Design a protein around this nucleic acid. Structure first.
Length: 297
RNA sequence: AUUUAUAUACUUCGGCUACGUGUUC
């Protein structure tokens, strides 16, 4: 169980609905998708890295401090205002939060100190139209990009057998030169990675409790969802989009809509996910990653 | 052969990125 540190140094576009939307972190779906496409391009085998590996979502970090998503636990006060405005809780204070030891003023201070990047829109045009030869409008369009301070970035949580971890490290060595976002070929999204161990993160990841904090985007398989939702606090997130090299027409190929729990849901009955298939009318199967990575407290 | 040694005034005034055009198939 290692973590992988990511520093960017170039703006990255991550996207929700259009190109001119900017987003800070990315989900396990696009992460596994990038790993899988990099593997296929490299020509190695996918069986090893399909049904053994567990990937957690990407989360941001700052100078020396790491972050995790806000648990969706019922804190019984009544402000319900400063906490709603909080999105990430530093690791130093995680167990303090889950025991209701976080004060309103401390929450305000954390919100004040949480600057880890800013948003930008760069305007771009496209003269590929008749403009080159005849009177034709240049078509302006915008892309949403997000940048980090020189001491920031994203990090991973990965776990599995050591052989799978070695394969993952190889693939990431390959991948640091492809992208991890949107307009990869337009100049966005190259990174350097580094493997680090953290004593505090390790203790947090190997705790023992009664609840569970979901750190990835997963969906229970058909026969286990019924028992999964006995006592659950969760939010669903729709995940759609097109696919890369499935048929002749990109604009005719579009993945089937899929729904999965978010990255902060709390469950009482642990379930195992699966790599659901979201293909139809296609030559090769298309995958989406739904497999949980729990922390028990 | 015996005293000046450039002197006062003014040291730039007047008149202050327009159009195709932003988004999608």
């Amino acid at each position: 169980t290692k973590v992988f540190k990511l520093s960017f140094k170039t703006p990255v576009h991550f996207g929700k609905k259009r190109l001119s939307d900017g987003e800070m972190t990315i989900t396990a779906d696009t992460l596994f998708s990038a790993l899988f496409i990099e593997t296929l391009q490299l020509g190695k085998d996918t069986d090893w890295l399909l049904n053994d590996l567990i990937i957690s979502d990407t989360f941001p970090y700052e100078n020396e401090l790491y972050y995790l998503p806000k648990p969706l636990i019922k804190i019984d006060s009544d402000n319900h205002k400063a906490f709603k405005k909080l999105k990430y809780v530093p690791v130093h204070h995680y167990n303090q939060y889950l025991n209701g030891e976080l004060s309103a003023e401390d929450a305000t201070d954390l919100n004040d100190i949480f600057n880890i990047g800013y948003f930008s829109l760069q305007t771009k045009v496209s003269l590929i139209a008749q403009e080159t030869d005849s009177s034709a409008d240049s078509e302006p369009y915008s892309v949403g990009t997000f940048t980090f301070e020189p001491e920031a970035g994203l990090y991973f949580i990965a776990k599995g057998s050591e052989e799978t971890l070695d394969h993952l490290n190889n693939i990431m060595t390959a991948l640091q030169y492809s992208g991890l976002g949107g307009k990869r070929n337009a100049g966005y999204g190259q990174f350097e990675y580094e493997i680090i161990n953290n004593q505090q993160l390790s203790k947090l990841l190997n705790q023992n409790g009664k609840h569970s904090i979901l750190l990835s985007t997963a969906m229970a398989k058909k026969e286990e969802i019924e028992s999964a939702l006995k006592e659950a606090r969760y939010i669903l997130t729709k995940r759609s989009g097109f696919v890369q090299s499935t048929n002749y027409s990109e604009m005719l190929v579009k993945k089937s809509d899929f729904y999965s729990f978010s990255s902060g849901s709390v469950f009482k009955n642990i379930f195992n996910g699966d790599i659901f298939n979201v293909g139809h009318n296609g030559k090769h199967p298309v995958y989406r990653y739904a497999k949980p990575l729990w922390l028990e407290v």
